[PDB]
Copies of this chain bind each other. A is one copy, B any other.
């Protein structure tokens, strides 16, 4: 936990400074409200079990940002390959994530930092 980590002189992760698992859950739920309300994006999710997807995305984001929870989903490249996702769609999704973070009161500098973790994933997510 954050307390145990501080006793061990480990620096505070992005996961911990934004509020850990509960913060991420709330952000991911809001993120998908936004993504599914966006008609440039909704159709990508037409065949998707959304409770399941959100579960996996919480796990992925938590792990990417320094959380201790395992990611129990499939590899990014495999999942996204062939879905005709361009950098335009990736960027829109990134926008909605930034919006969800903003809505949750995450400081803008920390959102930028998170975007810097997430942006390089576009390589695995997009077709081009």
A residues lining the B interface (CB < 8 Å):
30, 34, 37-38, 70-72, 74-75, 78, 95, 99, 102-105
* Bound Cα distance A103, B102 (Å): 30
Q: A75-B95, A75-B99, A99-B75 are in contact. Are A70 and B104 (CB under 8 A)?
A: yes
Bound-state Cα–Cα, A75 to B102, Å: 11
| A70 and B38 contact, Cβ closer than 8 Å, known pairs A75-B95, A95-B75 | no
Q: Which of B37, B71, B102 contacts A71 (CB 8 A)?
A: B102
**Identical copies in the complex:** 2
Q: Which of B37, B38, B70, B99 contacts A105 (CB 8 A)?
A: B70
A78 contact from B38, B70, B74, B102, Cβ within 8 A:
B38
Closest CB in chain B relative to A74 CB, distance in Å:
7
Contacts of A72 in B (CB 8 A): 30, 103
Contact check, B75 vs A37: say whether CB atoms are below 8 A apart.
no
The reply to whether B104 and A34 contact each other, CB–CB distance below 8 Å, is no
Can you name the residue of chain B whose Cβ is closest to the Cβ of A92? B78
Whole-angstrom distance from the CB of A112 to the nearest CB of chain B? 16
What's the Cα separation between A75 and B104 when bound, in Å? 15
Selected contact of A74 from candidates B37, B74, B104, CB within 8 Å:
B37
